[PDB]
Point group: D2
Chain length 483, copies 4
């Protein structure tokens, strides 16, 4: 299989391809053509021009309707999309069918809907001559949106950015992860078949540094760069767009805590932390790699979680009650296994996991690791502080409400946090004191697409979601009429 770039309405190859690997079994699944600096410039110029074409002339309602057709296009090829994400990543067919693909569709539907309903402001004012003035605001396309997306939730995170971008009338140059190029390529076909004017959506394959990612980033023709990924990659990008003073939107992961209070529903919290630690094999930026549990229930909690964790099925995406697939890649497994060892060096008790499963088949050539639970490390340990991005969590006891708040907040990251308690006063009091963008109480990763989404400190900059996306992906202009 070969995955081409999509530039100015044409699928094109490059002067260099690269392997896309299935991490279930290490087998090559396709050659991906790597866009070069020339092709990137070509994509940007084409997106700039397309702003002055038919796309630019579309009414908000026709634009929305076309976006709903992009979404219809995905629905009609649903299983081809499921297959595509599964292949690239190893994610369980069930996850892909219920989480990834439906959310990608909902992204386009939600922001199309918003594009139609959203409105702006009127401000009246008095003036010395007694005639007054009117200020009104409008939202306009920001211009060319640069999109650089990660491998963990490929289509979901790709469309999270492309959808509001197009809904706001922008054009897009989008660079998916080298590891997960398939679903995006399919989207490009959907765009094309749906009659999205050429130059409106441009797909470019490649890597970061000295490759398509960097080139997009250094290109003066774009108006914004929105990115989800590694915090130091965010910092790099920010420096790159600085001379052009481009608008930036970053969601940059973290080291999230779950907190379980003594008055929690223990069984729900055990199940809740299982999901928050090991979903997508712990390759979500929202996952809890840190857990704090009240001393009075620490041992019981750890016990039940170990039990539930060892019940998880690690195998083929289509395997029966499968719960976990592999890591994205071998490189990523090597980093994760590297932390596995560091955890021991650091004094950790390994409650469960700590290595890789054994298959004695093709999967042994994959990139699987085991769900892991550590105990007994210091709050200052590297394993408790640095983001691992694997199916791992360290559990630690706490005694006081203010103590644990202080411990959750003592981090250079602050994306999300999950809190377990049945007490009303407690839930609201504690929630407002956690220094993150996103709190969940008695649940995790529940997403209403209208809400502001993002992080504090190293975990990001700006917010996306609902009107926050409508604002970020638009020029806000103020028009003042003297009367």
């Amino acid at each position: 299989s070969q995955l081409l770039n999509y530039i100015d309405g044409n699928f094109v190859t490059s002067a260099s391809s690269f392997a896309n690997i299935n991490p279930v079994n290490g087998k090559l699944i396709s050659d991906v053509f790597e866009a070069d600096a020339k092709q990137v410039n070509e994509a940007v110029v084409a997106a700039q021009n397309a702003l002055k074409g038919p796309w630019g002339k579309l009414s908000v309602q026709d634009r929305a309707a076309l976006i709903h057709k992009i979404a219809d296009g995905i629905q009609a090829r649903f299983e081809e999309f499921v297959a595509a994400e599964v292949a690239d990543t190893g994610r369980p067919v069930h996850q892909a069918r219920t989480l990834d693909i439906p959310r990608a569709i909902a992204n386009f539907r939600t922001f199309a809907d918003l594009a139609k309903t959203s409105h702006t402001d009127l401000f009246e004012m008095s003036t010395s001559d007694g005639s007054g003035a009117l200020n009104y605001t409008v939202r306009k396309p920001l211009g060319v949106i640069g999109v650089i997306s990660p491998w963990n939730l490929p289509l979901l995170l790709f469309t999270w950015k492309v959808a509001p971008a197009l809904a706001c009338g922008n054009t897009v140059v989008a660079k998916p992860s080298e590891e997960s190029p398939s679903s995006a390529t399919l989207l490009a076909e959907v765009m094309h078949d749906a009659g999205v004017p050429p130059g409106v959506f441009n797909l470019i394959h490649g890597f970061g540094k000295d490759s398509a990612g960097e080139f997009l980033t250094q290109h003066p023709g774009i108006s914004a760069l929105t990115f989800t990924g590694e915090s130091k990659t965010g910092s790099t990008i920010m420096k790159a767009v600085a001379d052009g003073v481009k608008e930036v939107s970053f969601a940059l992961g973290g080291k999230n805590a779950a907190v379980v209070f003594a008055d929690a529903d223990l069984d729900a919290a055990i199940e809740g932390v299982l999901r928050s630690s090991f979903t997508n094999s712990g390759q979500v930026c929202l996952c809890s790699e840190r857990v704090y549990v009240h001393r009075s229930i620490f041992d019981e909690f750890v016990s039940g979680l170990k039990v539930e964790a060892e019940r998880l099925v690690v195998g083929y995406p289509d395997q029966d009650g499968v719960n976990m697939g592999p890591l994205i890649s071998h490189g990523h497994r090597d980093k994760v296994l590297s932390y596995y060892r560091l955890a021991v060096d650091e004094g950790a008790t390994v409650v469960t996991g700590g290595g890789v499963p054994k298959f004695n088949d093709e999967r042994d050539q994959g990139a699987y690791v085991q769900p892991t639970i550590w105990t007994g490390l210091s709050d200052k340990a590297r394993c408790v502080t640095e983001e691992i991005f694997g199916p791992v969590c360290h559990i630690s006891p706490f005694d006081d409400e203010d103590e644990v708040i202080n411990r959750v907040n003592d981090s250079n990251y602050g994306l999300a946090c999950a809190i377990w308690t049945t007490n009303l006063s407690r839930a609201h009091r504690v929630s407002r004191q956690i220094h993150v963008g996103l709190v969940w109480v008695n649940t995790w990763y529940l997403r209403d697409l209208r809400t502001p989404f993002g992080g504090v400190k190293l975990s990001g900059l700006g917010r996306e979601g609902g009107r926050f996306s409508m604002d970020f992906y638009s020029d806000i202009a103020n028009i003042c009429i003297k009367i």
Copy 2:
């Protein structure tokens, strides 16, 4: 006069001092103690700590009441602030009495009011178990706000940032321009006398590079850097804070155009462009340095603007009928004059000005220049494309509406634009097509502080004003409760 730093509730000197010069006559007004890296550190640390003190326990209404007291205090020392601003900058006293100090009061009052009125959002959602969930959002203090302000509208631009910062419950470390430190130092006194808690507001004096400005910018204890200034400085600051992924808010350079259509009120437009080109001696980021005038009225408009410009009184701040003061400094005058000769070299006709007035008194040791009008340059001339930030404009004819829209927009800047026309459709049709953040029709620099303010391209990123400031100077947190 001696201008001290204000750090953790105390006025402090530093090891080194620099001179504050009166641009009217080149005389020394005061010595200004330069904060060093260690003092910058103390200010940041005090500000972090102040967030955990009494300031952090104030209700929103009590916080607002204290902010109104700050504003009362400025009011009570109104003429001192006027004299301070005038001393530093040479601005006409009547401008300081009607624009500068009044706006600085209004900034505090408006954001104190928004602090009390502003609310957040509630989103209900359905879930699988049929019980649903609530998402609600809150605004919290972002933390410590780094403010770095320019010399052109010292107290106005300073308080424009400090007012919302405080209103949103942050603490502040603020560095006013080395050219214009007096009114900020006075403001510190008002802060102290109003009983603002120690560490909440901190004033550090100095320069940019290798000085208080850069130290502030590099300090990891800050949560945000808000800046109005040269766009190249903005880029530098963006790079400096990138490793911390600090929130940023930039209002930067302009090369703003005024457009005068055939159906304009010609006298009103002449008076209008007079003000937009030469207000504050052209030292406003909003000034018009490019002027496009319909062919059929070009010659008359140019003749009218020449006469009106030659009528401008350039002189002392309290001189009868004075319209224009000097430039901020000799250094800035060197730059302006350099453009003045470059314009000749690029082939400009000098309709008026082009040099420095001769007073034959102490003002000759000052930093005055003449209001200056050019004609005859191409749209590619450096003098038509680069920000001068002096009392200057180039005037060029046009024939067609779409033609002029494209010429205005053909720029790496995009801050503001003023349009002159008596035609209803024209005002609205043209304004929405200008690629800037701010348009005025039949007026200029009319400000409603609730409006979103800011630029596109090199002219900035982000918006401030009204709820845009309430969002930028706050952590926006989403709290999701499973029911």
Copy 3:
């Protein structure tokens, strides 16, 4: 037996039937079963019970999807709705295809979308004990919405109420005009086939006083009454529901002015006033029956309008080039001719029309009248102050801006006004001074469904449209949590 009621998911007949007449030729179209008190009761109880059924259990997303299905259902039977509308009202077939039916569908689509986008508010407050409290608001179904609709834009106005009613989770009992029950009956079928649960949407036919309308009005089981129609009927309805303190929403009569300034595009204004006076044979609450023209263009405006008026083709709905159909009924024709005679007795000059066309075919049995223009009446003439609701306007000269504002405003009505001018300041300066709910400048009846729609004085109470409808059709509840 032709047009049945639709109660609790079944079409049902009644004890008495009445005739539906085609106003093109006076011929009987259908027999309509008049709901009696018992049946009105049955409808309300069933709507009451439906709230406690699966309709009550839908998530906002599923409820929206269902509403979109109702729209799809109307779309699938587009031509049948056209024929139904045309039959009852005599409206030109092209108007039905481009205005009436498309707007009915748009009504459902818009409010379905808003149901999904709309959110509510979060207010934080401090409390004596220093722990604070939260207030959040929610929208819930108000309950059973009683809908009483008029005959002039039958399906458009019917669905303008039903769409938001259903979108906010209410159930409905709706009574269409005795003159135009067909398209509403067809909607009931669409609702049945779409699977809308029984009790959710109920259709009852009949008259006002001593009939289905009155009884709906007097039933204590409804939660609100929303009504479009005559003013005196609004008053009657307001009194009827008073003992129950039911929520009310009224758009009533108007005696709307168009104002034409000397700087208007004269050709566009003539065409504009031709449409605002004669569209739907002048049977729209937004029609202009008063017209004020600046003296310098009066004679020419009048001559222009007369010519264009006499071009209008009055005839069959499917007649080649037809512009105007008949009036709704013979009884309405008699009212309109009563004013046509009064205008003469009051001294009017009849510029054109003033009687009934003679067709020498079945149309002479229908209810046609001529498009009429009067001149020469005083501002206090009855024909100039009372709503006629036919295809007529009086044209009067004016001289001064403040004069014409006062004359427009001197009315017990205040629904809408149209202003023609090319001057920017004038447009905004004058529009804000007109005492109505709706102003159009250089156009007429341009409708954005997000906008607040309603009148002042006798022309109504409350606003509908956008969030105004989402508010009126919902219980707004504040919930305050002590922390």
Copy 4:
């Protein structure tokens, strides 16, 4: 003491006067002049004219400043307002000093602030000709606001209506309860002294039927009637303004429940129900006259409440530790006692109270009753369904959560509800299911002035507070410009 009307800038007497009685001891406090129909007409006409005077030329900022001046003037006479409120009604001095007078002040300041911050909307749209259109809304004064207020919270409720009315630039004709005329008369003094232009604020005294109140409602010159009070009185008013189609805003009766769940903080719940039943001697529309307590804690709850209720000090407004003053009047006491008798007749157990205290001093000539608790009545007893408006509650056990929801909602009223529970889920799950406008969890009558305030069913129509008042007291107008 003499209490005059204030009409068109002048205090005036009337042909007839009536007595204002102190309910503590039954003594004459003052003579009140009853406005006749001629004088009401004079007030409304002056109010209409005032809209065209200087009041109408004030900028929003200036109008706001003047309203803050009104508030200052009350603050400067703080204790005279305390004395006036206490004299009229017998309320405890501490309640007047902490709730009543401070709220009146906060009313004016809140709405003054909102006047300055509030803005409106901008809606862009496409058109067939491709040029587009824009819609913008504005808020303007509605006109003359009729205000009719009750005696239970005289200045709080009076200024709750007058503040937003003025803040929205309206003029006012206001009629306080004949039982509590004093504070409103002092406010007329403050208005005069503050320079409020003549006709802007008019104070008329008297009764309802055949007196000033009725005449107000019948006057065609008013634009709206806002009213708080008895439900049947709301109905009578709604009918009276029906012919004019005036805007109406009603907060009316309630028979509010408190619900104590088994997981409640039992002592906090007992204190909270004590306050919600007996504050202001049970004379708040928001008081809980029905109480439901889970079976498992019912006996302990009732014992506890008995004890705390018998601790209450009933007596003089400035008496040491006084909890309750008298009822407003002997007539009102007659009503409440007849309900005391009915409760016994209906089978109630009198847990405490049930009569009148014996003072053996001048308070025996006052209108006091005992705080009263009943038990053992059915949900259909008159004393459980009808509003008594005195210091009483009936307590009933429940078993099931859905059961108690149904029981609370089984009412023709629906003003407020208070729920006691420490459980997170329960607070949010149950609160959204209560059919009222206002829910409190673990508190009572905690008021954020920005929130929507009102009732459902017989308990009112519409909402006030925050933007809801800003909309009700304004013409909302949509202005549509074709471009």
